[PDB]
Scaffold this active site. Structure first.
Site, mmCIF file in Angstrom:
data_model
loop_
_atom_site.group_PDB
_atom_site.id
_atom_site.type_symbol
_atom_site.label_atom_id
_atom_site.label_comp_id
_atom_site.label_asym_id
_atom_site.label_seq_id
_atom_site.Cartn_x
_atom_site.Cartn_y
_atom_site.Cartn_z
ATOM 1 N N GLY I 59 0.808 -1.203 0.000
ATOM 2 C CA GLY I 59 0.000 0.000 0.000
ATOM 3 C C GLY I 59 0.844 1.256 0.000
ATOM 4 N N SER I 88 5.281 -5.402 -2.353
ATOM 5 C CA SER I 88 5.832 -4.089 -2.046
ATOM 6 C C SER I 88 6.296 -3.953 -0.598
ATOM 7 C CB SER I 88 4.803 -3.004 -2.366
ATOM 8 O OG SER I 88 5.362 -1.712 -2.205
ATOM 9 N N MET I 89 5.855 -2.884 0.060
ATOM 10 C CA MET I 89 6.241 -2.605 1.440
ATOM 11 C C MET I 89 6.028 -3.778 2.386
ATOM 12 S SD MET I 89 7.755 0.126 2.162
ATOM 13 C CE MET I 89 9.018 -0.884 2.922
ATOM 14 N N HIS I 113 7.010 -5.332 -6.588
ATOM 15 C CA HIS I 113 6.152 -4.283 -7.138
ATOM 16 C C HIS I 113 4.902 -4.061 -6.279
ATOM 17 C CE1 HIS I 113 3.277 -7.320 -8.661
ATOM 18 N NE2 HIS I 113 4.367 -8.058 -8.772
ATOM 19 N N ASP I 155 7.106 -6.805 -12.711
ATOM 20 C CA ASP I 155 6.081 -7.457 -11.893
ATOM 21 C C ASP I 155 6.387 -8.943 -11.695
ATOM 22 O OD1 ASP I 155 4.587 -4.954 -12.068
ATOM 23 O OD2 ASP I 155 3.980 -5.614 -14.069
#
Lengths: 181, 178, 182, 174, 183, 181, 175, 178, 182, 182, 174
Positions: I59, I88-89, I113, I155
């Protein structure tokens, strides 16, 4: 030749000028208004036969009976030909064509009930359905009890069944035979 | 001759030129304004009879009375012919046609029942009953009584009621008429 | 002779060329602009009488007063005939017609108040209403106190009551008598 | 002869050909662009007077200044005549008309009324109105903050217009 | 001679036939396509000067750079005149006019940034690439350095006609019957 | 100790029990109803001073005058303290606090006009504004003409200007001095 | 032991009773009213320090100044600690903390950037306050306030917004 | 004692137990149903006076008359106290309070003006005028006349009109009263 | 013994009191705030290992970095265990766990990604954060900045095993069900 | 003694324990289900009289007839008292109360027709209305022809007219006389 | 003593503890899941009779068959009692009640009424209704196609219920 500037409106006009009309859409105020104008307009030109192709799910019974009144008011005979799907008031209109001139293409599905719904005044809705049954009765020789029963059970007929029922006089022969005839 | 390029607008235009108008929609500001303009236009051409086909659920009482006024302001006679369904304000307009020239098709259904300061809405209704009363030769009492009970009449009943003068004969007899 | 290709626009045009206009819609920016354009155009052709049929609930007093200005600006005299319903500025425009030429059909309902609502700045709304009362006062001979009182109580008048009020000069008599007239 | 085949578009066209324009809409991108094209077009036919009837609540200051630039770019004189309601940017345009040729109908109501950018434009707008009316920038600033409408005569005395068109109907307050 | 039939389409058509075009809309797929069609069409008639009035907040940089390509593709020279508000690619197009023929009316406001937003439409790296490229093209048109251009853009810098000239975006400020209070 | 189960409702309750109320929201039916109930409820306990922090853009003048009536009906004195933004009826309520007990924090912005709009009957709206001006007049010693003029021009005052105007009696001294005092 | 009933309301309540508040929302009427209520409440208990974690994009300038007044109106010291993202009015609140007790985590991002004449007056006023909190000149504040400039935790300290950058077991790639 | 856990619901509950109810909202099905239930509940406890604070724009005439019926069905007297704005059906309810115990705060604004079969809407209005007439000792004619002209009265005017019995004195004199 | 009053809140509370947290939702303001308050609360009780189950699409990068900050702020070691989808994070948080204490379930999918969209528009800032997220992951996996970025641009989806070989986790938890590709 | 913690739910509960229910809402699935549950519950406690205050426009005839069944199914006698407005099935339920125990407040307006519309299959709608008329007929002694005629014309009755009609046994007299009664 | 602290939830709970359930809602995922849990729960306390008041228009055939499976999975007998309206899937459930214990209130109205999957379920549904009523699958098929409502007595004669609960109010048509 083929003096045409439009590929939709001008095509319908071409047929209209040959006394051929299309009742291929839901029956409502606007639709019945156009059809009635057209019938009156043509009957004014001359009293030769008028051909009406019918592919409609019906709609407003009031509007249908108005069309039915005009049908029987003009002098010109009206030969009806159905295809696609024909129901309720559309079927009654199909059945009111000049006896011997009521036809249907092979794959047409014909029913008495309304596929759009009883809604388009409780007692008035019943009075109109009952009245519709009476007209269909006189056009097919079937009794009103039969018509009503068949309408209540959502009875779908094929072209041949519609003919045996008395809705049409003949099934138009095509280059393609029907798997169940 | 077949001077028709369009199949909707042009057909109506042809009848309009033959002094035939279709009041087949709800009665409102826009509709009333088109009809009055058309009536005043036809009456300006000549004073021959004007025929008006009526198939309407009714609408604005104010606009209906404006049409009633124009009906009686012009010189030409107006013959009303109903088909389909005619109710409230549309029934009064049908009844306000030239005495002896008010007609109806066999399957037409005719209803009186009607119903913005409250005091005004009533003044208009009472006024409507009076006009319908003089058009039908029914007492105001009768009109109001029948208007309260949401009741549809068939073409013959409408004639006996005094709303129309005759039922147009058709190649199809009505199962309940003769 | 019926040289018409349309059943709406052309009918209105036929009347426009005979100096007859129809103020039969809510008075707003668009309608006022069109009516004003039309009046100026007609007064440019010649200065013969212009007839305006009125059937409107009124609307924006600003636009209404603009019409009133153009009304009294052109050289052509204006005949006003009402039918249906007429209110607020519509009534004032009706009452501004050439004296002796303000007419109304029997069933017309006429009122001073705004049936569409006083909403087309508080002090400015009041300023315009008060000004409207003044103009109607000078057109009918009723006092401004009377006009405002009648407006505040939503007073509806029939054609005859409107004549006696001084809004119109006469009630056009038709083939149909009015249940409460003479 | 009334050779108009329409009652709305053709009537406007008739006046346009007589160098008469109507600015009776909110001042926005579309109306500014339209008007500017019309002004540039007329000025290209000849340089006779162009009359502009104004009845607008105002709008985009940027689009108003463009119209102002075009007003003073063409060689034709522009005479402004207001009726109905004229406010903000529309009032400046009314005021920017050719000196001595700015008029108004009796019942017309006239009102004068990024972050740093919005203020820059208002300040600049006050200066223009100032030169047009001879009122100091201070008076414009002050009178614009208190949302107040002027009647035709007051607009003349203010310096926004040059005269009040007289009519067959006298104004109760003049 | 006023052979016009409408006050909008015909007025623009009358100017178009005189080699005069208006770029008074946002720069997007549709408007860029029309302008390009029009430019290619005119240049096809003859190669005389084409005049373009500009009053646009900009829009799509891709569609902007496309118009720029067409600008320098045709033989006809283009003189640009801005009024109202000009920004981003609109400003660049204004600056790409024939040197010596780039003008602006007095009250026009000119800026480098995008007032409608850079997300006009997120491919981050591409957005940055198109802006840096925009900066380079503006740099070669105004003689300003890419650093100055970028710094000015990032700070939402609004210029008046004169400041635009000094910046090198336009060659001259058209004199008007109404003098600008700050000039 | 600190008997608290909730971090919002229980905090307001804690102050309410100490006769401290918050008028920090738009003035409407619901808001005036809660405030009036509260004032009446507290005045029933005892007649000690009630403190009301005010940070409101105002709202309905009718509701404000209702609050104003209750303000002056209960026996308890009411000391008003403003912060944030205070306008229209909120300002009049601020100004009706017990003389000498009307205060305001340094950065409070005070105005007479309504930032929410004259809408929350043309003649009735004017009557209420005029009436509001009269009450503010009696609370500040300013004339009604002045009040009205200042309201028409959307006049925004700082804490010190509000005091000189007569809306509050003192500007609360804070650890942070105001750049323009 | 752990007497918490739920992992949300009660966890914040536990920290609140320890004079710790989380200002991780947007700054508006509702948010300010709550924070102001809480501060006044805590200061009513005793006058120990009050810790406020800040992660907010900012919001209403009026409500921000209301908080500013309450900050300097109460007797308790307020140590501000930022993390995540802090912008506009929220950055001013961060910098308005008790001098020497204003902190920020390593990755926090800090940025300085309805009548017309009023919105302007509030921005100007905001600059002066931020100015006296950072010892930066009013011009600098404004200049940086116009170029949507983001500062890392260290740059914010050098700017005068925070006093120190909380050290953590993870070194910052650019510190 | 300060047995309050909530600052909204509990405050109202406290007053309800002291026989004090707030009719500070529109009058509709839901609102009328809450008030009647509350009135019947209080009257079941004992028959001491019930106080009702009124600040309402009005609402349903049918629901208003139901409240009027319950007002007169219970044994306890009901004293009405208005503040803010009271209109239409809310004014009748204010006036229907126990004679001598109908009061109003200084700045309250009171309006009569009112306004779904049409015939019924009028029957209800005429019926309302009669009740308001007996409550104020004004003729039905006067009531109807004043109801047609959207007019607000101040507290003193309302008293002189017969809607309330007295204006509650306050530490703040009304600029137009004495 | 099971003295719970509801199958949701209380079940999570049971694990919370055992220093077990679930980061099984999108990372945003609300989520970060809750996790951060929870980490600070547990670290205040004692300094024992804190387990965090992870199943999140990631997010807001800011909110993610803030969580990462608190992670390294508290004294308690944090062991990360992932399952479902981690991106991601969320992936970086997974990798930031105590070296040797980063585990994952067989069928877990991991990417660098952002599946929810790189737009949780300040362009330069978004690029600064993405780049700033790469280094952190780089230091956590030993992979180079170019590799992390290259893999993020395409990706790329990894299975549990590939994640270990990549350096995101230390070991794949063995289960009664073997993975068809391990 | 006022042992109440709420001003709505608890007030209704206080009455429920005294065998008093409020049928003061549109008759639909939800309300019929609740009223039926309540009646059965009360009749389970004992068989003393149950009082039902009625103020409803009616609604679904099916649900209304279901209430009628439960009404006559339980052993407890039912006292019905109307106020406000009562229509369709509400009126029938009102008229079904124990003879001599059907009351109405003075200002109640009672009607047979459905003010909410006959829309809660054509033949089934007719079947239910006809059945409703029959039940009301047996409760009032009016003929089914009369009932239907009165329904079709939207006949509104005041309390006294309702008594004479046979819907209620008496009009409760209050401190306020009715302008058109005695 | 009436120890209920609520008039809606508590009343239902009181009946649930007396083995009485209300199926007065459309048959869907949520209501099926709720009912099934309730039935399984009651059957786990003891195996005494469970009474289910039914007034539903029907719903999901799949969720209806699951309820049917649970009806015949538990050991407790299920007695069904209908009131109001019962249609389609709800009628089958009413019919599937313990033989001899299926009842209905006098005014109750009862009605019987992927692509290949929707038909497969209807066919299967007809067979179940058939065994429950003793009507041939043909009669069910036929009677379901003509949307027709039965009164309580007709439902009994049809084999859907075993008896019509008599009340203090006689039905005009029985």
């Amino acid at each position: 030749h083929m003096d045409i500037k439009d590929m939709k409106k001008d095509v319908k006009l071409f047929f209209f000028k040959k006394r051929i009309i299309y009742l291929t859409d839901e029956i409502n105020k606007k639709t019945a208004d156009e059809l009635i104008s057209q019938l009156l307009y043509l009957d004014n030109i001359n009293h030769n036969d008028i051909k009406i192709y019918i592919n409609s799910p019906g709609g407003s019974i009031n509007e249908g009976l108005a069309i039915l009144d005009i049908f029987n008011y003009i002098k010109s005979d009206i030969q009806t030909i159905s295809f696609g799907l024909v129901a309720s008031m559309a079927s009654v209109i199909l059945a009111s064509g000049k006896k011997g001139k009521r036809k249907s293409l092979p794959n047409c599905r014909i029913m008495i009930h309304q596929p759009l719904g009883n809604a388009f005044q409780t007692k008035e809705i019943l009075y109109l359905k009952k009245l519709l049954y009476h007209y269909l009765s006189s056009f097919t020789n079937q009794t009103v009890e039969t018509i009503e029963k068949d309408s209540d059970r959502d009875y779908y007929m094929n072209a041949l069944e519609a003919k045996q029922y008395g809705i049409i006089d003949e099934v138009i022969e095509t280059k393609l035979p029907h798997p169940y005839f």
